[model samples]
Target: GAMNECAFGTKDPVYLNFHDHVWGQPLYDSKALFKLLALESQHAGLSWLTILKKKEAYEEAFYDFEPEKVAQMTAQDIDRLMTFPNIVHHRKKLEAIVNQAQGYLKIEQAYGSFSKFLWSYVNGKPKDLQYEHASDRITVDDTATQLSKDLKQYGFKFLGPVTVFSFLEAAGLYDAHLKDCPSKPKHN
Candidate 1:
């Protein structure tokens, strides 16, 4: 039997769901990408489990992550979410969502789709790597570093190399799943 080693030991259902359904899976929708971008920022200095548990709260606060709508959120909106329950209460992190949405719009306009812009960095394919076990997972790499730098120039915040590395994995720009993990995308 195969299992996602990362989620193997966790009894938490949220972790199990992400391991089986979302992590290391190709997510090409621009809106979904933007949503993950903001959520990844929120995961800074915290466990992904925490963010995943409150995903709905974050979604509601950010207008379901609609870039066109989130870009319009103001300081008051940030302040409002700071008091919102269940979501990460950090003001700067909340503020970052608005900035990221604005930047997302720019990327969408320049590249026709944010998904294309992101996939271009990986030659339009998920950069799959072989790993014998979870211990072999590479957390950060040059590609993630370069992408983070470019994103910063484009006005995205709270996205350092490590965060971007995690983001790339989460978005499936880099498929970091272990070789035999059940969730690993299979190719012919």
Candidate 2:
């Protein structure tokens, strides 16, 4: 009954806090996208709650998601961070961000802004949906798949359609908040 206020993340204060204030909120800045992508990439085969609780450590381990800085990270750096407190200890996951950071720069250089490149998928606007309930929501879509392919072409990793769809919503390119949820977008 208490969950009617949102589609998910209503049970825990930490998750509820993010659902209310951060999730699906528009973030157009390059560093912000970098940060979100790095964190989202770690969600593969793991619970998001696992990553959410370690947000601060991820922030610390990744140099605050600075693309230029992260792009320059070496395998040695990835190796070093394997022991980072509270962060996912997977080596490939650590490497994914360093590689994705480079990809981010490439897209930024080609499109002028990573924000413009990504927002272009939704025609520079968020796709606020009309899902009346959580069951009406879909985990993936053609648009997200297309974006994932394009991102792979640009060398992004750990971002398949499912992850891309989540990122899209998390970045506010698609606002999938339930109709009755207080977090749903209320205006154009």
Candidate 3:
């Protein structure tokens, strides 16, 4: 079997940065948690590079994913985002961002902090998996199934099992670092 580096050389610099700096790293901030989830949801059926390239535009349009601000967005706001070349330009996807923001706030009020609520699903720890090759890893799992179901029940859109799994990976609930990756911990 071959080893994987912390930053895969084949990936774009921005993607590598996200993988090294944020992916699989536990996050407890409400705003950041929602922002990442919102972005990941937008990535449904789309390449991550597309989302990464438009990250700045997303930040600018969504007011940095501030739940209160995004929750207040109107149809006009959606119209404005449609003109931004950097974003995905799909009306439904853009609308989902706002809807998810509102959903995020509801979760926050119910759970205190979105992080606390989200991390509780995994008991505040990252699940380390064994993968001999990248192909052995999965994009969806039981955790994602449950999470996605819950989110849908809460009025969130564009969140399927696969999307939830990716969001979890991005939000750091699961760490899929290759066995030879330096970040992997030895089994005690």
Best by lDDT: 1
lDDT per residue for candidate 2 within 46-111, as digits (tens), equals 888889999999888988888999999988888889887889998888888888999999998998
Question: Which candidate would rank higher by lDDT, 1 or 3?
Answer: 1
Residues 141-187, model 1: lDDT tens digits:
99999999999887899999999999998888887877877678874
Arranged by TM-score, best first: 1, 2, 3
TM-score for each candidate, following the candidate numbering: 0.95, 0.95, 0.91
Cα deviation in Å at residue 137, candidate 2?
0.9
Arrange candidates by lDDT, highest first: which order?
Answer: 1, 2, 3
Which regions of candidate 3 fall more than 4 Å away from where they truly are? 1-9, 183-188
Candidate 2 collision pairs: none
Better of 1 and 2 by lDDT: 1
Candidate 1 minimal-lDDT segment of 10 residues: 1-10
Candidate number that wins on TM-score, 1 or 3: 1
**Pairs of residues clashing in candidate 1:** none
